[PDB]
Amino acid sequence: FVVEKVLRMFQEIPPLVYQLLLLSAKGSKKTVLEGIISFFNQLDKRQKELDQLRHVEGTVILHIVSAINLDQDIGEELIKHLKTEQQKDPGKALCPFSVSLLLSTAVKHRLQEQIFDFLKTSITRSCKDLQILQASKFLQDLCPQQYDVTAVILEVVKNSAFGWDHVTQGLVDLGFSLMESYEMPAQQACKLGASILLETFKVHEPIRSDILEQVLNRVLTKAASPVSHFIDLLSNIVVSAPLVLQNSSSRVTETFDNLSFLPIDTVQGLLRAVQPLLKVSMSVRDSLILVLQKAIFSRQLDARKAAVAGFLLLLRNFKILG
Amino acid sequence: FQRSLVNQLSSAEDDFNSKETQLLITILSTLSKLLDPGSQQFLQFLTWTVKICKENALEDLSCCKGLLTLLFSLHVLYKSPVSLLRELAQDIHACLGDIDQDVEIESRSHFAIVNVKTAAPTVCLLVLGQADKVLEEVDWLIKRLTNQTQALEKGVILQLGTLLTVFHELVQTALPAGSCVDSLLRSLSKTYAILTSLIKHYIQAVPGRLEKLVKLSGSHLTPQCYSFITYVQNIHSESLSFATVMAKVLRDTKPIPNLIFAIEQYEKFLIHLSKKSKVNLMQYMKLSTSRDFRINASMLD
Amino acid sequence: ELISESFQYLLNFQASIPSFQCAFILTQVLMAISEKPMTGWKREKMASLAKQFLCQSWMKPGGDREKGSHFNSALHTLLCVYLEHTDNILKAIEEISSVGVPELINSAKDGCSSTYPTLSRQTFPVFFRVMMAQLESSVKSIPAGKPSDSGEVQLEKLLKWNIAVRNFHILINLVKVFDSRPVLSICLKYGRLFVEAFLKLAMPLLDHSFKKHRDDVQSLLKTLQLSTRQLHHMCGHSKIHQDLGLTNHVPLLKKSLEQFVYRVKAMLAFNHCQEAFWVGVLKNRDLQGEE
Secondary structure, X not given: OHHHHHHHOOOOHHHHHHHHHHHHHHOOHHHHHXXXXXXXXHHXXXXXXXXXXXXXXXXXXXXXXXXXXXXXXXXXXXXXXXXXXXXXXXXXXXXXXXXXXXXXXXXXXXXXXXXHHHHHHHHHHHHHHHHHHHXXXXXXXXXXXXXXXXXXXXXXXXXXXXXXXXXXXXXXXXXXXXXXXXXOHHHHHHHHHHHHHHHHHHHOOOOHHHHHHXXXXXXXXXOOOOOHHHHHHHHHHHHHOOOHHHHOOOOHHHHHOOOOOOOOOHHHHXXXXXXXXXXXXXXXXXXXXXXXHHHHOOOOHHHHHHHHHXXXXXXXXXXXXX | OHHHHHHHHHOOOOOOOXXXXXXXXXXXXXXXXXXXXXXXXXXXXXXXXHHHHHHOOOOOXXXXXXXXXXXXXXXXXXXXXXXXXHHHHHHHHHHOOOXXXXXXXXXOOOOOOOOXXXXXXXXXXXXXXXXXXXXXXXXXXXXXXXXXXXXXXXXXXXXXXXXXXXXXXHHOOOOOOOHHHHHHHHHHXXXXXXXXXXXXXHHHOOOHHHHHHHHHHXXXXXXXXXXXXXXXXXXXXXXXXXXXXXXXXXXXXXXXXXXXXXXXXXXXXXXXXXXXXXXXXXXXXXXOOEEEEEEOOHHHX | OHHHHHHHHHHHHHHOOOOHHHHHHXXXXXXXXOOOOOOHHHHHHHHHHHHHHHHOOOOOOOOOOXXXXXXXXXXXXXHHHHHHHOOOHHHHHHHHHHHHHHHHHHHOOOOOOOOOOOOOOOOHHHHHHHHHHHHHHHHHOOOOOOOOOOOOHHHHHHXXXXXXXXHHHHHHHHHHOOOOHHHHHHHHHHHHHHHHHHHHHHHHHHHHOOOOOOHHHHHHHHHHHHHHHHHHHHHHHHHHHOOHHHHOOHHHHHXXXXXXXXXXXXXXXXXXXXXXXXXXXXXXXOOOOOO
């Protein structure tokens, strides 16, 4: 009755809900978690028709993630509650505040694999349900409502552009992990990861270098399978910001050192993407010319074909007019 | 492009050019996707296709298959297709005989495209595929069912009520011994499983509509399946008379046990609902019927 | 030598035992001292001791019998260890089912059977369950029919199957007298297991030996038909009376009983004798009656 009444009894919000978090660590965590999540849900819905509200949201989720890190037992009950909500409603209880809170907790390895698995299965189920509903009008007549989860996952990008720290970290982690998860709904998931990475690069100005380093390292990790979509993402991210590549240089040469290992026509895309880096800088041009000289004199055809194919792009890139 | 097809269909039998008609139908199918479903042009196109299928009569198998596929692809996006399936089931039932062998049926030819030549496994598999799609749709909807609840249940019950008539019409057809029988038996087992899944919800969660559905299933579908199972014995025996024989027999006789198992599962859950709700739902369903066997030693020589 | 000496020392106590429970723990400790898979002479002595305890009569000092739940559990375990170690399981089952039950029903108005005083109208379901389960386990042990690799081994295998079928028929016939719900539940549960074991194991043998031997195969199938018919009638009775405990076993049993017929048709088709096969509808009949 106490928690119900004080939940009914809604600046001073973060200390107050911190006190309730301690009391519910003594008492029942699920009820207060549901109450606060719902309350912020109608707050956001009212806002749908703000800066202080976003600051309050960031502060309170910071207190919640700090408390959950202090006491990790609450997380299992929270995930059980969310599983029950997902069972009870067709993708309901997944709002921008809730997913922001979930992403904030997915940085300290507190069962982050479980978080990613839950999000992935929910996303695939939502996409499959929408796909089935779109096919027939008889379904559309009876079941008009639809809970598209991609809409909220895109909206939390804009919601998290006001300075939240853990939220963007978890968001980038999910966006990267979706690429490995995808390895058709899988194409939808891959496009969904590419869109999230493009949006969070376009938004998070201070975090450009970390994203560039992460995608560059992932691109040249191992040529086990086709990674052409990674190269498309590389082109899309680098074409937006030209000077960004210059700051994070001297890693391009390391990738160039072993380009002629598993070329599947991705070398043309990579060279076309990083051509702006090559034209402005002469050191990269010298290193690439050295690699091409190594390739052309090679005695094996497999490396030779990629070498001459890249060599053609090198020749056509630079104008010889004067 | 409609004029060329209209001209070729009305041409004399001397010059037909079946490949031209097939390509024209495929082009029409490809171009139909551009039309907006809400436009009046879509309704005009549907009316033209239905008129063409009803009026003309064709003997080529591929042309009829293409035309019916086009018609169903249009009809799914606009309304439920069960009425057309019922009409086609009645037409194919009229075209061929009946297993009873003491009943006379005359005329009632709704569609001229369906005739004695065309009532082959083509139209029988084409109809059963659409029925399977409808059943998968209803299976998806029922799991969502588990003020809105009343509307959803009222919507769900009508589909099964209409589909039972289609299967009742098709069960009483003396079909050939091919894949058309196997598809029929497998679809029968599937629909009984769907009815079981529906009843399990009311177990977990009485009304007049469900009682009417159970009465209809008991009266129209349950007794006919056993008669069909008797007829297919003679059908398969006559087929095997003309012709790895053990593998052929096992493949031919495979789906009957699954049908029996599905019927008994439905009966079991129906009894559970009956005794947990104080309604004698079992009054509608008759007793079961079982098959024995014997060996004629005289005919062994 | 030490194990054998201790075994003899403990076995010497069998004369003076005050009640059932002491004997039950005596069998437990005797089994515990021995190895996992017991050896010949110890196995024979254990079987003799178990039968000796089974054939005795246990009464309290104040008269009356020892009817109770703990008595039932001890009796179940004693029957299990007795049948697990007998020289020929089917001979023992046939002897019990052909002697003890008829002398119970024919004579004993309210008492027990002369040969087996432990057997009584309260304890009959325990005997029925143990005998049926052990029969199914014994049937499952027979090897499968090899692809016509057996010369004169098929005779021995057919003899074993014939004995098993006769025992199954005798056990099935007892259900007509005792109409208790546990009896029907046990028989419905285990009849399907016996039938699927027969389909999985026996039919490859009848495929590859129908040409050489014919009369034995037809007699075997004709004997099995009676038990299958009575199983159908029991399923019908359980469905009519609407017993929730009983109806759970009907569907799988009916599925297997339907598979049996078409497997026989495949057996005939394997030897180009498909013209002789015939199928018809079986008239419904209640238990111990008609219509």
